Design a protein around this motif. Structure first.
Motif, PDB file in Angstrom:
ATOM      1  N   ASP B  19      -4.695   9.144  -2.644  1.00  0.00           N
ATOM      2  CA  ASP B  19      -3.652   9.232  -3.573  1.00  0.00           C
ATOM      3  C   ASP B  19      -2.120   9.494  -3.138  1.00  0.00           C
ATOM      4  O   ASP B  19      -1.128   9.081  -3.783  1.00  0.00           O
ATOM      5  CB  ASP B  19      -3.916  10.831  -4.249  1.00  0.00           C
ATOM      6  CG  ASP B  19      -5.257  10.838  -4.807  1.00  0.00           C
ATOM      7  OD1 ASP B  19      -6.049  10.316  -4.102  1.00  0.00           O
ATOM      8  OD2 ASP B  19      -5.455  11.575  -6.069  1.00  0.00           O
ATOM      9  N   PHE B  20      -1.819   9.409  -1.904  1.00  0.00           N
ATOM     10  CA  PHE B  20      -0.669   9.648  -1.273  1.00  0.00           C
ATOM     11  C   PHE B  20       0.331   8.221  -1.387  1.00  0.00           C
ATOM     12  O   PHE B  20       1.508   8.446  -1.809  1.00  0.00           O
ATOM     13  CB  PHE B  20      -0.605   9.864   0.241  1.00  0.00           C
ATOM     14  CG  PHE B  20      -1.698  10.693   0.851  1.00  0.00           C
ATOM     15  CD1 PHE B  20      -2.074  10.690   2.149  1.00  0.00           C
ATOM     16  CD2 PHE B  20      -2.081  11.870  -0.065  1.00  0.00           C
ATOM     17  CE1 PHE B  20      -3.233  11.719   2.490  1.00  0.00           C
ATOM     18  CE2 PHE B  20      -3.347  12.676   0.484  1.00  0.00           C
ATOM     19  CZ  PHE B  20      -3.572  12.538   1.700  1.00  0.00           C
ATOM     20  N   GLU B  22       0.636   3.756  -0.280  1.00  0.00           N
ATOM     21  CA  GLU B  22      -0.253   2.571   0.329  1.00  0.00           C
ATOM     22  C   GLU B  22      -0.102   2.672   1.785  1.00  0.00           C
ATOM     23  O   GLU B  22       0.221   1.689   2.580  1.00  0.00           O
ATOM     24  CB  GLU B  22       0.844   1.262  -0.209  1.00  0.00           C
ATOM     25  CG  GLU B  22      -0.185  -0.090  -0.254  1.00  0.00           C
ATOM     26  CD  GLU B  22       0.817  -1.405   0.013  1.00  0.00           C
ATOM     27  OE1 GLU B  22       1.351  -1.623  -1.052  1.00  0.00           O
ATOM     28  OE2 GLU B  22       0.773  -1.831   0.986  1.00  0.00           O
TER      29      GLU B  22
ATOM     30  N   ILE C  71      -6.638  -6.502   2.228  1.00  0.00           N
ATOM     31  CA  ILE C  71      -7.386  -5.793   1.093  1.00  0.00           C
ATOM     32  C   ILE C  71      -7.135  -6.545  -0.265  1.00  0.00           C
ATOM     33  O   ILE C  71      -6.057  -6.870  -0.706  1.00  0.00           O
ATOM     34  CB  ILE C  71      -6.829  -4.286   0.939  1.00  0.00           C
ATOM     35  CG1 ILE C  71      -7.047  -3.443   2.290  1.00  0.00           C
ATOM     36  CG2 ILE C  71      -7.547  -3.433  -0.379  1.00  0.00           C
ATOM     37  CD1 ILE C  71      -6.142  -2.117   2.203  1.00  0.00           C
ATOM     38  N   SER C  73      -8.505  -5.958  -4.426  1.00  0.00           N
ATOM     39  CA  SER C  73      -8.953  -4.853  -5.457  1.00  0.00           C
ATOM     40  C   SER C  73      -9.204  -5.446  -6.533  1.00  0.00           C
ATOM     41  O   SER C  73      -8.350  -6.235  -7.144  1.00  0.00           O
ATOM     42  CB  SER C  73      -7.836  -3.938  -5.247  1.00  0.00           C
ATOM     43  OG  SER C  73      -7.050  -3.560  -4.252  1.00  0.00           O
ATOM     44  N   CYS C  75      -9.095  -4.662 -10.261  1.00  0.00           N
ATOM     45  CA  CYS C  75      -8.530  -3.363 -11.230  1.00  0.00           C
ATOM     46  C   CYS C  75      -8.673  -3.599 -12.486  1.00  0.00           C
ATOM     47  O   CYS C  75      -8.968  -4.585 -13.124  1.00  0.00           O
ATOM     48  CB  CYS C  75      -6.994  -3.631 -10.952  1.00  0.00           C
ATOM     49  SG  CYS C  75      -6.274  -3.049  -9.212  1.00  0.00           S
ATOM     50  N   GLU C  83      -3.442   2.421 -15.241  1.00  0.00           N
ATOM     51  CA  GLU C  83      -4.216   1.507 -14.033  1.00  0.00           C
ATOM     52  C   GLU C  83      -5.218   2.065 -13.555  1.00  0.00           C
ATOM     53  O   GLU C  83      -5.057   3.366 -12.991  1.00  0.00           O
ATOM     54  CB  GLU C  83      -3.204   0.536 -13.233  1.00  0.00           C
ATOM     55  CG  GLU C  83      -2.733  -0.636 -13.903  1.00  0.00           C
ATOM     56  CD  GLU C  83      -1.853  -1.593 -13.071  1.00  0.00           C
ATOM     57  OE1 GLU C  83      -1.058  -1.124 -12.139  1.00  0.00           O
ATOM     58  OE2 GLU C  83      -1.806  -2.691 -13.109  1.00  0.00           O
ATOM     59  N   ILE C  85      -8.434   1.419 -10.334  1.00  0.00           N
ATOM     60  CA  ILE C  85      -9.158   0.484  -9.215  1.00  0.00           C
ATOM     61  C   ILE C  85     -10.799   0.926  -9.414  1.00  0.00           C
ATOM     62  O   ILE C  85     -11.257   1.793  -9.796  1.00  0.00           O
ATOM     63  CB  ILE C  85      -8.668   0.707  -7.797  1.00  0.00           C
ATOM     64  CG1 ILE C  85      -7.223   0.148  -7.658  1.00  0.00           C
ATOM     65  CG2 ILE C  85      -9.732   0.387  -6.927  1.00  0.00           C
ATOM     66  CD1 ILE C  85      -6.530   1.052  -6.489  1.00  0.00           C
ATOM     67  N   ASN C 121      -6.295  -8.475  -7.138  1.00  0.00           N
ATOM     68  CA  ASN C 121      -5.094  -8.396  -6.554  1.00  0.00           C
ATOM     69  C   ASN C 121      -5.317  -8.321  -5.037  1.00  0.00           C
ATOM     70  O   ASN C 121      -6.326  -7.862  -4.305  1.00  0.00           O
ATOM     71  CB  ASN C 121      -3.920  -7.642  -7.145  1.00  0.00           C
ATOM     72  CG  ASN C 121      -4.320  -6.206  -6.844  1.00  0.00           C
ATOM     73  OD1 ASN C 121      -5.258  -5.688  -6.532  1.00  0.00           O
ATOM     74  ND2 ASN C 121      -3.434  -4.986  -6.862  1.00  0.00           N
ATOM     75  N   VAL C 122      -4.369  -8.546  -4.112  1.00  0.00           N
ATOM     76  CA  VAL C 122      -4.500  -8.663  -2.799  1.00  0.00           C
ATOM     77  C   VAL C 122      -2.968  -8.134  -2.184  1.00  0.00           C
ATOM     78  O   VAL C 122      -1.913  -8.339  -2.614  1.00  0.00           O
ATOM     79  CB  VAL C 122      -4.863 -10.191  -2.017  1.00  0.00           C
ATOM     80  CG1 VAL C 122      -6.045 -10.782  -2.605  1.00  0.00           C
ATOM     81  CG2 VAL C 122      -3.740 -11.257  -2.537  1.00  0.00           C
ATOM     82  N   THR C 123      -3.386  -7.998  -0.820  1.00  0.00           N
ATOM     83  CA  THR C 123      -2.405  -7.469   0.081  1.00  0.00           C
ATOM     84  C   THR C 123      -1.251  -8.581   0.284  1.00  0.00           C
ATOM     85  O   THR C 123      -0.060  -8.252   0.445  1.00  0.00           O
ATOM     86  CB  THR C 123      -2.643  -7.105   1.476  1.00  0.00           C
ATOM     87  OG1 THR C 123      -3.959  -7.876   2.040  1.00  0.00           O
ATOM     88  CG2 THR C 123      -3.303  -5.700   1.445  1.00  0.00           C
TER      89      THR C 123
HETATM   90  C1  LIG Z   1      -3.400  -3.666  -6.853  1.00  0.00           C
HETATM   91  O1  LIG Z   1      -3.123  -2.936  -8.123  1.00  0.00           O
HETATM   92  C2  LIG Z   1      -3.279  -1.690  -8.167  1.00  0.00           C
HETATM   93  C3  LIG Z   1      -2.836  -0.997  -9.300  1.00  0.00           C
HETATM   94  O2  LIG Z   1      -1.486  -1.462  -9.726  1.00  0.00           O
HETATM   95  C4  LIG Z   1      -2.243  -1.268  -7.063  1.00  0.00           C
HETATM   96  O3  LIG Z   1      -2.518   0.383  -6.931  1.00  0.00           O
HETATM   97  C5  LIG Z   1      -1.576   1.184  -6.935  1.00  0.00           C
HETATM   98  O4  LIG Z   1      -0.779   1.128  -5.918  1.00  0.00           O
HETATM   99  C6  LIG Z   1       0.412   1.985  -5.928  1.00  0.00           C
HETATM  100  C7  LIG Z   1       1.505   1.786  -4.719  1.00  0.00           C
HETATM  101  O5  LIG Z   1       0.720   2.331  -3.653  1.00  0.00           O
HETATM  102  C8  LIG Z   1       0.253   3.210  -6.411  1.00  0.00           C
HETATM  103  O6  LIG Z   1       1.501   4.340  -6.497  1.00  0.00           O
HETATM  104  C9  LIG Z   1       1.375   5.462  -6.062  1.00  0.00           C
HETATM  105  O7  LIG Z   1       0.958   6.428  -6.855  1.00  0.00           O
HETATM  106  C10 LIG Z   1       0.666   7.593  -6.198  1.00  0.00           C
HETATM  107  C11 LIG Z   1       0.215   8.663  -7.202  1.00  0.00           C
HETATM  108  O8  LIG Z   1       1.020   8.411  -8.400  1.00  0.00           O
HETATM  109  C12 LIG Z   1       2.259   7.937  -5.549  1.00  0.00           C
HETATM  110  O9  LIG Z   1       1.873   9.178  -4.833  1.00  0.00           O
HETATM  111  C13 LIG Z   1       2.955   7.018  -4.720  1.00  0.00           C
HETATM  112  O10 LIG Z   1       4.204   7.414  -4.356  1.00  0.00           O
HETATM  113  C14 LIG Z   1       3.102   5.869  -5.499  1.00  0.00           C
HETATM  114  O11 LIG Z   1       4.085   5.624  -6.633  1.00  0.00           O
HETATM  115  C15 LIG Z   1      -0.519   3.411  -7.475  1.00  0.00           C
HETATM  116  O12 LIG Z   1      -0.927   4.758  -7.734  1.00  0.00           O
HETATM  117  C16 LIG Z   1      -1.995   2.596  -7.275  1.00  0.00           C
HETATM  118  N1  LIG Z   1      -2.523   2.621  -8.558  1.00  0.00           N
HETATM  119  C17 LIG Z   1      -3.892   3.100  -8.567  1.00  0.00           C
HETATM  120  C18 LIG Z   1      -4.636   2.986  -9.901  1.00  0.00           C
HETATM  121  O13 LIG Z   1      -4.677   3.422  -7.614  1.00  0.00           O
HETATM  122  C19 LIG Z   1      -2.723  -1.639  -5.671  1.00  0.00           C
HETATM  123  O14 LIG Z   1      -1.681  -1.471  -4.899  1.00  0.00           O
HETATM  124  C20 LIG Z   1      -2.770  -3.244  -5.814  1.00  0.00           C
HETATM  125  N2  LIG Z   1      -3.418  -3.552  -4.650  1.00  0.00           N
HETATM  126  C21 LIG Z   1      -3.133  -4.434  -3.409  1.00  0.00           C
HETATM  127  C22 LIG Z   1      -3.955  -4.554  -2.375  1.00  0.00           C
HETATM  128  O15 LIG Z   1      -1.888  -5.045  -3.516  1.00  0.00           O
END
Ligand SMILES: *[C@@H]1O[C@H](CO)[C@@H](O[C@@H]2O[C@H](CO)[C@@H](O[C@@H]3O[C@H](CO)[C@@H](O)[C@H](O)[C@@H]3O)[C@H](O)[C@H]2NC(C)=O)[C@H](O)[C@H]1NC(C)=O
Ligand SMILES: *[C@@H]1O[C@H](CO)[C@@H](O[C@@H]2O[C@H](CO)[C@@H](O[C@@H]3O[C@H](CO)[C@@H](O)[C@H](O)[C@@H]3O)[C@H](O)[C@H]2NC(C)=O)[C@H](O)[C@H]1NC(C)=O
Ligand SMILES: *[C@@H]1O[C@H](CO)[C@@H](O[C@@H]2O[C@H](CO)[C@@H](O[C@@H]3O[C@H](CO)[C@@H](O)[C@H](O)[C@@H]3O)[C@H](O)[C@H]2NC(C)=O)[C@H](O)[C@H]1NC(C)=O
Lengths: 142, 87, 142, 142, 87, 87
Positions: B19-20, B22, C71, C73, C75, C83, C85, C121-123
Motif C-alpha cells: 500500500d505504501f 511503487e 512487472i 499487471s 488491472c 482502480e 489489480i 500495463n508494464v514497468t
Molecule cells: C498499473 O496500473 C495500476 C493501477 O493504476 C498501478 O497501480 C497504482 O500505482 C500507483 C503508484 O504507485 C498507486 O498510487 C499510490 O497509492 C497509495 C495508496 O493511496 C499511496 O500511498 C501512494 O502515495 C500512491 O499514490 C496506486 O495506489 C496503485 N493502484 C492500485 C489499485 O494498486 C500500477 O502502478 C501500474 N503498474 C505498472 C507496472 O506500471
C-alpha cells in the motif's frame, strides 16, 4: 451450475511445502460445489472436466539456495487413490542481488472425480512472494 | 500494514502489504528493544510481503522496523513491537 | 451468448505504462458485448465470471535498466469504483548482451460487472516485444 | 457436446522441431471430435472458438547453445490455407552449470475451422524436458 | 515491412515485421541523409519489432537502415527515409 | 524405468522416468561393453528424462549407466545394455 474458483495467496509459519490460500481480495467461490479446505486445497463435489491453473511468483538467489531449481507442482488427491502430479514447472535461481524475481504459470485440463482435491506445492515456500496479485490459484468447470 | 503473527519462543512471522507506493527494495531490521546495539537487517523485495524470523531469545521484547526504497527516495519507517514467549 | 476476445499487441509512441492492442491478425471479438476501447482495454457489457489472460514478452538488460524487475499487471476499472489489480508477474532483467528475451503469462478467473474494463500495463513499455505471436491479451466468459 | 483435450509430452529421435505427444498419464480426449494425429497435432472436427494452451519446460545453457533464445510457437494448420503462428514465447538460455531449467506457458482464444490442426514447435527439441508434469499441450472448446 | 510513424520535431517511431526469415539479431542504423558521417546504430532482437528514436534535429531529412543476422548469414538491407518537422 | 529406443548404426534414444525419488542431477554414462576403458559421461537434470546418443560404432554391444544425486546422497545405479546395428 457455474462452478469456478480463484483464491489469493497468504503467508504462514508452516515450513511444509504446501502453499496456503484465502478467500480474500478478488477471490471467487461460485457455489458450495467448490470449496477451499484448510487453506491448502480446492475440493470439488461434481465429476467432470476442469481447467485448473496456478501462478507462483518467487524471489530467489543462486548463492544462498542449494544447486537445485525452484519446482512448483499442481497435485491431485482423489478419494481412495494415491497422490498424483498433474502439472509441474522448474526455474533456476537467479544471480541477482538480494534476490531475483520470476513468475511461473501452470494451467491444464484434467478430470476430477467427486471429492477430489487439488493443491499447489513448492520446493522452498520461504521464497514465494505474496504481494497483491503475484501468487494465486484457481479452477473452472467446463 | 505491518503485522506480527505466530510469535513463539524463538520465532515470529512478519507480514506487510503493498500500500505504501511503487517501492522496490526494503530493509527488515529487528533486534532487542532497549538493549542498545545488536540489530539484524534483511534485504527483501517490497512485493514479497513476508519474513519468518528465527533464533530469537525467549521472554524478550523485540522491535521490528521496515523502511522501503525507490532509487534515492525512501519510505516512512514503519515500526512494530513484539514480545517472544517462554518454555 | 458466446462472449470472448483475443487482441494482438501494437507498438506506440505513448511513454505511459498501459499497453496498446489491435483487432488484427488472429484476433477475436465474438459480439458487441465485448469491445476493445481506445486500443487499451477490453470492456464488457454483461455481469458474470470471466477467465482473463495476457502474455507479455520482453527483451531487457540488467546494466541498461535500473535495479528493479519487470512487472506486468492485469488491472480492472469497474464503473463507480477505484482502480484494482487482479494479477501481477515480476521478472529480473537478464544479463544477456543486447538484451535477454523472456515471456510472462497471467491468467485468472474474476467477476466483472457491466461496463467493467480490464487492461494490462508494464514497468517499461519500450522493452515489450511486439512480433507476431509474442504479446497478446484476451478474455472469455464462463 | 463437451470438446476438450490435454496430452502429455513424449521424447523421440526426430531432430525436426515439432514436439511429440501421447494419450498417457493424465491425458484427456473427451470425444472423437478432438483427435491427436501422428503424435504431433490436436485436430478438431467442429467450427468455433477454443482456448488452446501449451507448456514447454526446458533445460539449456548459454555457452553450449548458439547466441539465440529458446522460442516455442503454437501453430495452426487450417485445411486449404497456409501455416499460421498464433502464440509465441522466447527465453534466453541460462548461465547455470550443466543447464538451467525454465518453463514457458502459452495460452489463447482462437477460431478453429473444421479439420484444423494445432501444434507446438521449438527451436531446439533436445533441450525440452519430458518428466511427469513438465511438458504438456491441450485445448478446450467454448 | 519497415514503417516510420509518429514523426515529430525530435522523435519518430520505427516499426517492422517478422516476414524476412528466421533471423535473431538486427542493427537499426540511422543518421542525417546526405550529411556524410555521423550514424547511430542500435542492436535489437528481430522479433522486438519496434524502436522509438529521440534527440533528432528538427526540419531534417533522416535515413533509417535495417539489416538482420542469423549467425554469419545476413538479410537484405531494408531502408526507409523520413523528414522531421519543426516548431 | 530406463528404456533404450530407436537403436540404429550410430545412434540411440535413452529415456527414463521420475520414480526414483526427489533427485536433481544425474550422470548418463555409456561406452563399449567389455572393451575396458573409454567411457562418455553426461550431466543431465533428473526430470529431463531423455538423451539421444550419437557417434556410436556399428555392430557393437554398448552399456548405459544412470546414477542420480541429491546433495551428497546418491541413487541406485540403474544399468541397461544395447547393441547397435550395421549397414
Ligand atoms: C498499473 O496500473 C495500476 C493501477 O493504476 C498501478 O497501480 C497504482 O500505482 C500507483 C503508484 O504507485 C498507486 O498510487 C499510490 O497509492 C497509495 C495508496 O493511496 C499511496 O500511498 C501512494 O502515495 C500512491 O499514490 C496506486 O495506489 C496503485 N493502484 C492500485 C489499485 O494498486 C500500477 O502502478 C501500474 N503498474 C505498472 C507496472 O506500471
Ligand atoms: C508436491 O507434492 C507431491 C505429492 O505429495 C510430491 O511428490 C512426491 O514426492 C515424494 C518424495 O520424493 C515421492 O516419494 C517417493 O516415492 C517413490 C516411489 O514410491 C520412492 O522411490 C521414493 O523413495 C520416495 O518415497 C512421491 O512418490 C511423490 N509423489 C508423486 C505422486 O509423485 C512432491 O515432492 C511435492 N513437490 C514439491 C516441489 O515439494
Ligand atoms: C514452427 O513452425 C512454424 C510454421 O511452420 C515456423 O514458421 C515458419 O518459419 C519459416 C522459416 O523461417 C518461414 O519461412 C520463410 O518465409 C518467408 C516468407 O515467405 C521467407 O521470406 C523466408 O525466406 C522463409 O522461406 C515461414 O514463413 C514461417 N511460417 C509462418 C507461418 O510464420 C517456425 O519457424 C517454427 N518455429 C520454430 C521455433 O521452430
Amino acid at each position: 451450475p457455474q462452478i469456478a474458483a480463484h483464491v489469493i495467496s497468504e503467508a504462514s509459519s508452516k515450513t511444509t511445502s504446501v502453499l496456503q490460500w484465502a478467500e480474500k481480495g478478488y477471490y471467487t467461490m461460485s457455489n458450495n460445489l467448490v470449496t477451499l479446505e484448510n487453506g491448502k486445497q480446492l475440493t470439488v463435489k461434481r465429476q467432470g472436466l476442469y481447467y485448473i491453473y496456478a501462478q507462483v511468483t518467487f524471489c530467489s538467489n543462486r548463492e544462498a539456495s542449494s544447486q537445485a531449481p525452484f519446482i512448483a507442482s499442481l497435485c491431485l488427491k482423489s478419494p481412495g487413490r494415491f497422490e498424483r502430479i498433474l502439472l509441474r514447472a522448474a526455474n533456476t535461481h537467479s544471480s541477482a542481488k538480494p534476490c531475483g524475481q520470476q513468475s511461473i504459470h501452470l494451467g491444464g485440463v484434467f478430470e476430477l472425480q467427486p471429492g477430489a482435491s487439488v493443491f499447489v506445492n513448492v520446493t522452498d515456500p520461504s521464497q514465494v512472494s505474496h504481494g497483491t496479485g503475484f501468487t494465486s490459484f484457481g479452477l473452472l468447470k467446463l | 500494514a505491518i503485522e506480527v503473527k505466530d510469535v513463539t519462543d524463538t520465532t515470529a512471522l512478519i507480514t506487510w502489504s503493498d500500500d505504501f507506493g511503487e517501492y522496490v527494495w526494503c530493509e527488515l531490521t529487528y533486534g532487542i528493544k532497549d538493549v542498545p546495539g545488536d540489530r539484524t537487517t534483511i534485504d527483501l523485495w517490497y512485493h514479497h510481503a513476508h519474513y519468518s524470523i528465527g533464533n530469537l531469545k525467549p521472554d524478550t521484547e523485540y522491535e521490528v522496523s521496515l523502511i522501503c526504497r525507490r532509487g534515492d527516495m525512501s519510505s516512512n519507517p514503519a515500526k512494530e513491537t513484539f514480545t517472544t514467549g517462554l518454555v
